[PDB]
Design a protein around this ligand. Structure first.
Ligand SMILES: Cc1cc2nc3c(=O)[nH]c(=O)nc-3n(C[C@H](O)[C@H](O)[C@H](O)COP(=O)(O)O)c2cc1C
Ligand code: SF4
Lengths: 129, 62, 432
């Protein structure tokens, strides 16, 4: 294989000290790892394919001059994308973020029958089309 | 009564068209009250009688 | 042997021998002409024998689509589950130009009633529902009178014709809707809903009226079946070209000297039919512009095609049209052909049930374009635009009404495109 002499390191991978993040935004943050829910206003499912990581929402207040929404949270907009739940968890662990994982919610397969609309003796008979 | 007996039991809604037409022969045209009466006799939702009344061109709604 | 020229049907070989209502239409007159003769023996022969006779005759649907009747009716030849089975007779008769089924109902009602029994037996049906368009009130009353006579003679009802088979014949009247002639829309109307066609599958033979196995058959298809059984499928199959068998009722309307309904052999030349029975084209054959050979839903054909075309399913498919209901609409050279077709599009716009997108929106769109084509207020590029629109409707709709509105437009563009462009040229010059 390699000509480069490797070493053995059994430490858990932790990069908190070399990321430059302030202490406040490592230990007091909660990361949420989830697959986004489908926007119920539309039938397209293409935004439910990937895993996302977001952070706990913090205060927003009104700017005295204009009424704009101010924030002191540097992570308020950070959203990361991941192929699998395991990739998202691995990223959160090595960055030292506490996290919750929410299992993916796949719609269950349905039994669809057009003929059922015209049942002779069942309640599925439609009164209109 | 004889109109309704031409159809299987449990399918009285089949009588909406002929009974609605009968209401128009007695009255000349179909006021909304006549549509409601037909829906009441056959025990179908009134909206399902309005759909028939407005779908078919021989019903006079004025 | 294999006759190659067709027509000249003799009166003895005509099925609808009271077509013109000059003999008694009630039971006594019908029985004198051979109706209800040996019907008991036919029923006792069993469903398989009846269906075999229909298959051998080569009968095809007379309602406009022309599917082989024997194979179609055999979908019902299967063991019964819990549900009842029904025969629905399509007497809606809505296709512009078609009035043949009206004559059968009011002048030969007993042929229809006996056809319901024989056909219903072949399918294992317990009852027949005859759906007649609401405007045919006097025809419906004549049919209702004939049905009562049949019940009082023991021919239908319990132990029909003494065969031990129970059969009922109900008459249900429509309320004004061309779409209710469509077989699944007809079923929905009987069930008390808007006459909106169903998608298929399921097919009616599996799930039909009230959700039960059903066969929808045209009035003419049903009315010939007892005769096909009495005189044999071979006799009926001896008329017309192969796979186009039997006699056919023809309506000839429009610009002919004697518009009329007549029974003639299948595969008869179109020109012979107009000349022999309808008294020729108004102003002579040289005054002919175009013909719609099978009701409003079939593409028109120009005079050149009309010279030699035969009136049967396969012959008219070769002419890029169809037999349809065999309602021949004749237009002479004084006709405004664009306005004539534009009026048919306006008919389909008024008859679309509105259920499905390509017809609800497309047919209305074609109507607006055709209205401007009549005045010439368009440009030639819109002709190919109209062609593509019709192809987006055809084959994309739930029922065949969408197809029936696209075909007349395609026939006009196919055969009279210079007339469209000529009119566009006139309008631009006059306004500029
Ligand atoms: C818009 C529309 C209208 C129709 N109207 C009739 C009709 O009036 N009478 C009829 O027999 N078939 C009509 N049909 C055809 C029926 O759907 C069906 O093909 C026919 O009743 C089958 O009977 P047959 O096989 O004996 O011809 C219509 C179809 C469409 C799409
Ligand atoms: S094609 Fe037209 S008539 Fe047929 S189902 Fe669609 S909208 Fe209704």
């Amino acid at each position: 294989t390699r000509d480069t002499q490797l070493i053995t390191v059994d430490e858990k991978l932790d990069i908190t000290t070399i990321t430059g993040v302030p202490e406040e935004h490592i230990k007091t943050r909660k990361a949420r790892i989830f697959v986004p829910a489908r926007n119920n206003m539309q039938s397209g499912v293409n935004n439910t394919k990937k895993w996302k990581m977001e952070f706990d929402t913090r205060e927003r207040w009104e700017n005295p001059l204009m009424g704009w929404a101010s924030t002191a949270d540097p992570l308020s907009n950070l959203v990361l994308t991941f192929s699998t739940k395991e990739d998202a968890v691995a990223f959160a662990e090595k960055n030292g973020w506490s996290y919750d994982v929410e299992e993916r919610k796949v719609p269950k397969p349905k039994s669809k029958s057009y003929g059922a609309n015209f049942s002779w003796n069942k309640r599925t008979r439609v009164s209109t089309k | 009564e004889a109109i309704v007996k031409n159809y299987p039991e449990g399918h009285k809604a089949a009588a909406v068209l002929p009974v609605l037409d009968l209401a128009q022969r007695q009255n000349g045209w179909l006021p909304i009250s006549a549509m409601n009466k037909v829906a009441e006799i056959l025990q179908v939702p009134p909206m399902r009688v309005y759909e028939v009344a407005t779908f078919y061109t021989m019903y006079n709604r004025k | 042997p294999k006759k190659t020229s067709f027509g000249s049907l003799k009166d003895e070989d005509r099925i609808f021998t009271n077509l013109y209502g000059r003999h008694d239409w009630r039971l006594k007159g019908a029985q004198s002409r051979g109706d209800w003769y040996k019907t008991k023996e036919i029923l006792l022969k069993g469903p398989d024998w009846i269906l075999g006779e229909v298959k051998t005759s080569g009968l095809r649907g007379r309602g406009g689509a022309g599917f082989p009747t024997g194979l179609k009716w055999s979908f019902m030849n299967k063991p019964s589950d819990g549900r009842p089975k029904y025969l629905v007779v399509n007497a809606d008769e809505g296709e512009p130009g078609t009035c043949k089924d009206r004559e059968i109902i009011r002048h030969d009602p007993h042929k229809l009633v006996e056809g319901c029994l024989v056909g219903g037996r072949a399918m294992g049906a317990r009852a027949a529902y005859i759906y007649i368009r609401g405007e045919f009130y006097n025809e419906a009353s004549n049919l209702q009178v004939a049905i009562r006579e049949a019940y009082e003679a023991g021919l239908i009802g319990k132990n029909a014709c003494g065969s031990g088979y129970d059969f009922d014949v109900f008459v249900v009247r429509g309320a004004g809707a061309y779409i209710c002639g469509e077989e699944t829309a007809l079923i929905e109307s009987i069930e008390g809903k808007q006459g909106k066609p169903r998608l298929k599958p399921p097919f009616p033979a599996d799930v039909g009226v009230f959700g039960c196995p059903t066969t929808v058959a045209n009035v003419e298809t049903v009315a010939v079946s007892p005769t096909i059984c009495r005189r044999g499928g071979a006799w009926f199959a001896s008329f017309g070209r192969e796979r186009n068998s039997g006699t056919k009722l023809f309506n000839i309307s429009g610009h002919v000297n004697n518009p009329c309904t007549v029974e003639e052999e299948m595969s008869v030349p179109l020109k012979e039919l107009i000349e022999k029975h309808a008294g020729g084209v108004t102003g002579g054959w040289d005054n002919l512009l175009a013909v719609i050979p099978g009701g409003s839903s079939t593409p028109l054909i120009p005079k050149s095609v009309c010279e030699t075309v035969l009136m049967d399913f396969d012959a008219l498919i070769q002419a890029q049209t169809g037999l349809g209901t065999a309602a021949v609409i004749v237009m002479d050279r004084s006709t405004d052909i664009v306005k004539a077709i534009a009026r048919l599009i306006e008919f389909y716009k008024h008859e679309s049930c509105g259920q499905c997108t390509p017809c609800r929106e497309g047919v209305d769109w074609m109507n607006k374009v055709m209205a401007r084509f009549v005045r010439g207020d368009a440009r030639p590029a819109e002709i190919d635009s109209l062609w593509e629109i019709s192809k987006q409707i055809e084959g994309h709709t739930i029922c065949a009404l969408g197809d029936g509105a696209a075909w007349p437009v395609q026939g006009l563009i196919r055969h009279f495109r210079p007339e469209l462009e000529e009119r566009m040229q006139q309008f631009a010059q006059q306004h500029q």
